[PDB]
Paper text:
Here we focus on LEAFY (LFY), a plant-specific TF essential for flower development. LFY is one of the few master regulators of flower development, as it integrates environmental and endogenous signals to orchestrate the whole floral network. Structure–function studies have demonstrated that LFY binds semi-palindromic 19-bp DNA elements through its highly conserved C-terminal DBD, a unique helix-turn-helix fold that by itself dimerizes on DNA. In addition to its well-characterized DBD, LFY possesses a second conserved domain at its amino terminus (LFY-N).
After heterologously overexpressing LFY-N domains from different plant species, we were able to determine the crystal structure for GbLFY-N from the gymnosperm Ginkgo biloba at 2.3 Å resolution. This structure showed that the GbLFY-N monomer is made up of five α-helices separated by four loops. Comparison against the Protein Data Bank revealed a strong structural similarity with the SAM, also called Pointed domain28, a resemblance that could not be predicted from LFY-N sequences. Some SAM domains are able to self-associate as oligomers through the so-called mid-loop (ML) and end-helix (EH) surfaces. GbLFY-SAM appears to belong to this class: in the crystal, it forms a head-to-tail polymer with monomers contacting their neighbours through two polar surfaces. The ML surface comprises negative and polar residues, including T72, T75 and E83, which interact with the positively charged EH surface through hydrogen bonds and salt bridges, in particular via R112 and R116 (residue numbering refers to LFY from A. thaliana—AtLFY—sequence). Size-exclusion chromatography coupled to multi-angle laser light scattering (SEC-MALLS) showed that the WT GbLFY-SAM domain formed oligomers of variable size in solution, depending on protein concentration, containing up to eight monomers. In comparison, all mutations affecting the interaction interface completely abolished LFY oligomerization and GbLFY-SAMTE, GbLFY-SAMRE and GbLFY-SAMTERE proteins were found to be exclusively monomeric. However, when mixed at an equimolar ratio, the GbLFY-SAMTE and GbLFY-SAMRE single-face mutants retained the ability to interact, forming a GbLFY-SAM[RE+TE] dimer, thus showing that the different mutations did not alter the overall fold of the SAM domain, and that single face mutant proteins still displayed one functional interaction surface. These results further showed that the head-to-tail arrangement observed in the crystal structure reflects the state of LFY-SAM in solution, which forms an oligomer of limited size in the conditions of this study. Our results demonstrate that LFY-N is a Sterile Alpha Motif (SAM) domain that mediates LFY oligomerization.
Author numbering: 51 to 135
The structure:
């Protein structure tokens, strides 16, 4: 209950300014995604999850929302790598 709220806040923070809508975030939390998992996934694995959201989970994704999930993860990966220096 509080754990699901913590995960949603975590994803809201990651995807803020990337056009990911509330119901897309809600579905990702329900699927069990965390920020740490997403930053360690490949570009191809992120493409597969995006396809899974539409095909299996029937989430309605805008075109910019699909590009937004990938851009938010790329930016976070670059922020973490630059920090590691």
């Amino acid at each position: 209950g509080a754990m699901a709220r913590k995960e949603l806040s975590s994803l809201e923070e990651l995807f803020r300014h990337y056009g990911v809508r509330y119901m897309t975030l809600t579905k990702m939390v329900e699927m069990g995604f965390t920020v740490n998992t997403l930053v360690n996934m490949t570009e191809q694995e992120l493409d597969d999850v995006i396809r899974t959201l539409v095909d299996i989970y029937r989430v309605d994704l805008l075109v910019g929302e699909k590009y937004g999930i990938k851009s938010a993860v790329r930016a976070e990966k670059r922020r973490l790598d630059e920090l590691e220096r």
